[PDB]
Amino acid sequence: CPLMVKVLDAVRGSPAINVAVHVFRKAADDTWEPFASGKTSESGELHGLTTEEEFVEGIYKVEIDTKSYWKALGISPFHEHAEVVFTANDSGPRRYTIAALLSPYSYSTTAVVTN
Amino acid sequence: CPLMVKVLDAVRGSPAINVAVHVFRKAADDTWEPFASGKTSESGELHGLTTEEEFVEGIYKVEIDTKSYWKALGISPFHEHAEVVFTANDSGPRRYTIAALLSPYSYSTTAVVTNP
Amino acid sequence: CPLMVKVLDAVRGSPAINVAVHVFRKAADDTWEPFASGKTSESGELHGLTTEEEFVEGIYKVEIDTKSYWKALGISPFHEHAEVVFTANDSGPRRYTIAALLSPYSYSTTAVVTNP
Amino acid sequence: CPLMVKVLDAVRGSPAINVAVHVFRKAADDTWEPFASGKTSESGELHGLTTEEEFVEGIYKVEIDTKSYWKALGISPFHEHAEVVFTANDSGPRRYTIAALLSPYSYSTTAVVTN
Numbered sequence: 390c391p392l393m394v395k396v397l398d399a400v401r402g403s404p405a406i407n408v409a410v411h412v413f414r415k416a417a418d419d420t421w422e423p424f425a426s427g428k429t430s431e432s433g434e435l436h437g438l439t440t441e442e443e444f445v446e447g448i449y450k451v452e453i454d455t456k457s458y459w460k461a462l463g464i465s466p467f468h469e470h471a472e473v474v475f476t477a478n479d480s481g482p483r484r485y486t487i488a489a490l491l492s493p494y495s496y497s498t499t500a501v502v503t504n
Numbered sequence: 505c506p507l508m509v510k511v512l513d514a515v516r517g518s519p520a521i522n523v524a525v526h527v528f529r530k531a532a533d534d535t536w537e538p539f540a541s542g543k544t545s546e547s548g549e550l551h552g553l554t555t556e557e558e559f560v561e562g563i564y565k566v567e568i569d570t571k572s573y574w575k576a577l578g579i580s581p582f583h584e585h586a587e588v589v590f591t592a593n594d595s596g597p598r599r600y601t602i603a604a605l606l607s608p609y610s611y612s613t614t615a616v617v618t619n620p
Numbered sequence: 621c622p623l624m625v626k627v628l629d630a631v632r633g634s635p636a637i638n639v640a641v642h643v644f645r646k647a648a649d650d651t652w653e654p655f656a657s658g659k660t661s662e663s664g665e666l667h668g669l670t671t672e673e674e675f676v677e678g679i680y681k682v683e684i685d686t687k688s689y690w691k692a693l694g695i696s697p698f699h700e701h702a703e704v705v706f707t708a709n710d711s712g713p714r715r716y717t718i719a720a721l722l723s724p725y726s727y728s729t730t731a732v733v734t735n736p
Numbered sequence: 737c738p739l740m741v742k743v744l745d746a747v748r749g750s751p752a753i754n755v756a757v758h759v760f761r762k763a764a765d766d767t768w769e770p771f772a773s774g775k776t777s778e779s780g781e782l783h784g785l786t787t788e789e790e791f792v793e794g795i796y797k798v799e800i801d802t803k804s805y806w807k808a809l810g811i812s813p814f815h816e817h818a819e820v821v822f823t824a825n826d827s828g829p830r831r832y833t834i835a836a837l838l839s840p841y842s843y844s845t846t847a848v849v850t851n
């Protein structure tokens with residue numbers, strides 16, 4: 390599992406559950422091509438997005454659909470979604486974990502890259 | 505200004521200076537149209553991107569070119585940019601300050617919204 | 621000012637207003653002595669805590685009373701405060717801006733340090 | 737394991753390894769009494785700090801010794817240490833995870849409280 394996404398709710402101090410996540414890969418014509426997607430689990434995590442074979446070097450975008458998450462909680466948010474855009478590199482460690490910490494008017498995102 | 509972008513460097517404890525910022529607005533055909541752009545000042549701030557007249561209701565994307573910033577300091581960072589996508593002025597005109605705090609493998613983006 | 625504290629609310633996208641801030645300085649006997657205190661303004665900022673004369677080298681603690689802030693908004697938060705502990709002026713006088721961004725179960729604290 | 741601490745390095749995109757962590761509990765005379773301590777593992781985590789029996793309601797402080805971490809990396813940091821002060825509550829979920837994301841001149845800390 391070379392790509393995992395983890396989402397936390399900073400308002401409730403809890404995993405952000407049932408958050409839609411869409412991954413895209415940049416195509417040769419500079420458009421974003423759908424690559425993988427899912428919803429975060431009860432632990433705020435999304436695994437099984439891709440395989441080692443398919444996750445080749447390239448530019449990827451992870452969209453986390455934060456607005457719909459906050460709307461479900463009755464909380465008015467700022468962002469439409471959190472975006473994380475990066476180049477996958479074979480030189481570095483083999484596992485990427487994209488973490489996101491969400492508040493209504495702020496988010497932070499961190500990449501933890503390990504072997 | 506109705507729209508101001510501020511960028512800070514969490515490694516150096518400084519403003520992030522001369523960072524390129526591109527603003528786009530979503531068109532009726534769902535494409536991202538260019539809206540405004542500039543570079544952060546010595547204070548890490550970018551003012552004068554738009555006017556209250558031109559900054560109508562819509563979905564806007566602020567793209568902060570963080571990779572180029574880090575590379576110039578000798579650092580190879582994780583992200584290509586920091587993106588900030590939001591609906592603006594849907595409840596009438598507001599003033600928006602979009603801040604980003606940058607580290608090589610992490611960033612945070614925050615908005616402060618004030619009613620004139 | 622050589623020391624400025626800024627506090628923002630990540631739930632509302634606003635300054636955090638009227639937040640109590642206590643500054644302490646570590647004494648020779650390793651105790652925390654009171655140094656300055658105040659409350660954030662309508663802009664979420666607290667200026668005028670100290671002077672360049674009084675703000676000597678030392679270890680300082682800035683305690684931001686976040687629990688009381690959240691409780692007044694009807695929220696029961698996780699943290700009692702946000703604490704910010706740092707050595708100041710060890711390489712000569714510097715200007716320090718300490719910011720805190722608050723959510724009920726999370727906060728971030730950042731420093732921007734500039735040489736006069 | 738009712739209390740866990742997890743520390744990440746935002747500069748290197750990696751778990752923050754071998755970081756000293758000291759936990760204190762507030763005594764009746766308002767002093768901080770040493771309660772538990774350890775160093776983060778290769779995964780940036782510290783488990784086994786306390787037990788369900790000993791972790792009673794009260795005010796606790798978790799100090800994360802960030803300055804020594806950065807000094808080891810040759811990076812000049814702002815903070816002496818990251819502090820996290822909170823009241824343990826029996827009404828809520830039974831597990832506290834204190835997470836910290838570290839940069840030289842900034843840190844963020846989040847509590848994830850789950851069952």
Ligand SMILES: O=C(O)CON=C1c2cc(Br)ccc2-c2ccc(Br)cc21
Binds near residue numbers: 601719
């Ligand atoms: O990283 C943190 O802990 C919070 O940082 N966010 C900041 C900030 C930090 C500092 Br230091 C100075 C000004 C601002 C600011 C000014 C405007 C807006 Br919007 C946000 C911020």
